[PDB]
Amino acid sequence: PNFSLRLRIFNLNCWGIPYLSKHRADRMRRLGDFLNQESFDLALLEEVWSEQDFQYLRQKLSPTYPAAHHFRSGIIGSGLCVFSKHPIQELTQHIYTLNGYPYMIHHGDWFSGKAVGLLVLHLSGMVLNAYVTHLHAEYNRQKDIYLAHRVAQAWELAQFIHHTSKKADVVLLCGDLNMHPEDLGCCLLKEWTGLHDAYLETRDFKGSEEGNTMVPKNCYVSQQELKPFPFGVRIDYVLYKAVSGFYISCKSFETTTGFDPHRGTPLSDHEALMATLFVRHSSPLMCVLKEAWTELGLGMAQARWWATFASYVIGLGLLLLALLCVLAAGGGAGEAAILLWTPSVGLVLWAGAFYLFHVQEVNGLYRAQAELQHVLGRAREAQD
Amino acid sequence: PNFSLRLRIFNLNCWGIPYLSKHRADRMRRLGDFLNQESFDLALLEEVWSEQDFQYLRQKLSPTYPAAHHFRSGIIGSGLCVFSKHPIQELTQHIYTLNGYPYMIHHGDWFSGKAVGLLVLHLSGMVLNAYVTHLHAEYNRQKDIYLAHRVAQAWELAQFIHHTSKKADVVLLCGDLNMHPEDLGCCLLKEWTGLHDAYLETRDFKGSEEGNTMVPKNCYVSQQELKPFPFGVRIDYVLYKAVSGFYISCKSFETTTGFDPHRGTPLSDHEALMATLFVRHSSPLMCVLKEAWTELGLGMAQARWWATFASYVIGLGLLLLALLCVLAAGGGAGEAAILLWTPSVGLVLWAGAFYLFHVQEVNGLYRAQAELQHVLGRAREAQD
Ligand SMILES: CCCCCCCCCCCCCC
Ligand SMILES: CCCCCCCCCCCCCC
Ligand SMILES: CCCCCCC
Ligand SMILES: CCCCCCC
Ligand SMILES: [Mg+2]
Ligand SMILES: [Mg+2]
């Protein structure tokens, strides 16, 4: 027969960080009211770190959205809340192996345990796979110590979607990639999976200039962060694809322009993305993959160097400990050898933890690089 | 037309641990010779921690097996080597979130970074998904602090297979589950996925009494470990299932009886599993799931208690540090306040790391429990 489906998709990074976000409770309340009024088919909230906030929203949005799930991983949680007016048939989560560095507390991404969540919804006889994700943040554009990490996360995300979506008719990904469209990670994910950006394909667009999710107008956003880019950055995306026999088109795409759609203070530092999708029945560029392979190799070399440096520190600490024992045994100093001894022990223990973390990082980088190399090799065989 | 496929599957836990395994190099050499002579379609080796050993085997088995992959995760690596006479179309890996405790060095499973690996092989127009896995070990049968961990790992393994095998005609899992057939984890995996044990369904069985992979006869196995069970334990399995339109039967299943099939010293402490599978064209028990849900909840409660205990220790250390400063400021003791100060600082740092690890563990336990609860709830809705 004729199949027509209308999908209302809402994506918002809620910036609900406890004790670090202004007016967090008020923003949650406004968001709940907005969602109830709109009645989106699927709403994919992000950065809701507080469990209480999820429970506040789940109870508030219960009649409109009977199905709600929160993905939890890492110390502070993944932060992914998903609300659906349709019952979720299946749930699964993939957690990225290389989420940053713990010593970089000022950044703090490592404690998040970032992940990608899969929701399977069967709508009108059509399998839909929905993915919500939050990639590692970018702190300095000019120099990135997380460039390799994000590329690996993008590759793991691409692999997860490719493997788990075999039978899904429509594949939807809504997430804060944290990368520009030009950036390698976005290209790698799109080229492999085959997903298409909603903003690029929308018949009608209403909202912030250039669809930029982070905007100077928004009060919460720091001006210094957006000083390089005058109109702000587009780092949140709605990506969609359909199998043969199914055609999906993006009728209307909308953003809220740096403010609450009720003229109130913005809901979050980021910007809401609202996409209307209509579903009607009826080769990866190896250069992109090779560039990713090269970047991962550079990252691995740096990780190996850090592990080697750490091993040297452990050795130095051990030599110092031996020297301290000699001095104590001789008794020539006659004092404070014990005092110096305890910190020296701690140095060795800490340098060992640093070394172990780096060895694990090299293994993590290798896993992504090896899979990329495998794909590249097969492509070369096909070419020849 | 008529489709007939013969599959020769070999599974062996190689026990190739560097500096902890007797005759490791000799055993690797014997294994390479055996594999070359046999020419198994797929060989799924396990516990090969050394990279050099993998390279030794890959070069040796290269003409017979053009395709070989090693999965690497964690500090010491996953240890999964797979050799295939057929080119591997796709590779992906899932690493279990809750692999044990690092403080339990005597056990040492945490450093392994255990994982499940997926190999996609297209054979004669038929998609085959092959999974190799190694679950957490069991140390005391009577009391398990890893009971909850293994159940969570089994659930994550079941979910991974279920989601990634949508399009696969034949699904094969060969791994060291480390659990008896009666145990909950095996039941949970089999009930969800639908996999069938080869030993149970084999037309002909040759080998050790009761198919027990770990045997008293084998010299390497410690007698104390097998003191409770007279004939040994069956903890390695070959599990297989096929989609409708495809029928798979296990013609011959074989084990090597505690020795090298050449009458030499055994290849490993464990036992080789050799299954011949013929493929010819043409509801989960909620009680098992509910039992798993209950066990995870008990584990979570223990983890929460440990985190609370750790927080108390951090507080005590801080109070001690404050007291030490007071004494130093007063100068009444006049000595050794600095000496005592440094260890007290270390206590706080270590108790904090312990606390963070436990908070992460609670989140990990929650992820498995929430998915199980979701499935149980849907089943109840169907029942009513
Ligand atoms: C996300 C994975 C992070 C794990 C970091 C590895 C650190 C190793 C610490 C080992 C502690 C040993 C205590 C006896
Ligand atoms: C497999 C995951 C293991 C991670 C263990 C978490 C330990 C947290 C340690 C934090 C270290 C902070 C250093 C400043
Ligand atoms: C995961 C432990 C890392 C500690 C690094 C201290 C420099
Ligand atoms: C991952 C760090 C755990 C340390 C525990 C020390 C008791
Ligand atoms: Mg943020
Ligand atoms: Mg072993």
Author numbering:
A (entry chain B), B (entry chain A): 3 to 284, 300 to 401
Task: Copy the relevant paper text.
In response to extracellular stimuli, sphingomyelinases (SMases) remove the phosphocholine head group from sphingomyelin to rapidly generate ceramides. In mammals, nSMases play pivotal roles in ceramide-related signal transduction. SMPD2 was the first mammalian nSMase to be identified and cloned. SMPD2 mainly locates to the endoplasmic reticulum (ER)14 and nuclear matrix, and it requires divalent cations (Mg2+) for activation.
In contrast to previously reported monomeric SMase structures, hSMPD2 adopts a dimeric architecture with rigorous binary symmetry and with four transmembrane helices (TMHs) protruding into the membrane. In contrast to the density for the TMHs, the densities for the loop preceding TMH1 and for residues 403 − 423 following TMH2 were disordered and were not modeled. hSMPD2 is composed of a transmembrane domain (TMD) and a catalytic domain (CAD) and occupies a spatial volume of approximately 85 × 60 × 80 Å3. Each monomer mainly comprises two TMHs, twelve β-sheets, and four α-helices, forming a special L-shaped architecture. The dimer interface of hSMPD2 is formed mainly by TMH2 within the TMD and by β6 and α3 within the CAD. Dimeric hSMPD2 is stabilized by substantial hydrophobic interactions and π − π interactions between TMH2 from each protomer. In addition, residue R395 within TMH2 of one protomer interacts with Q91 within the CAD of the other protomer, and residues H164 and K168 from α3 of one protomer interact with E92 from β6 of the neighboring protomer. In the TMD interface, we also observed densities within the hydrophobic cleft, which we attributed to four acyl chains that interact extensively with residues F371, L373, and F374 within TMH2 and with residues P104, Y105, W112, and F113 within the CAD of both protomers. The presence of these hydrophobic lipids contributes to the stabilization of dimeric hSMPD2. In our current hSMPD2 structure, we observed a magnesium ion located in a negatively charged cleft in the CAD that is further coordinated by residues N15 and E49 in the active site. Akin to the reported homologous nSMase structures, the current hSMPD2 structure represents a substrate binding groove exposed state, that is ready to bind and hydrolysis substrates.
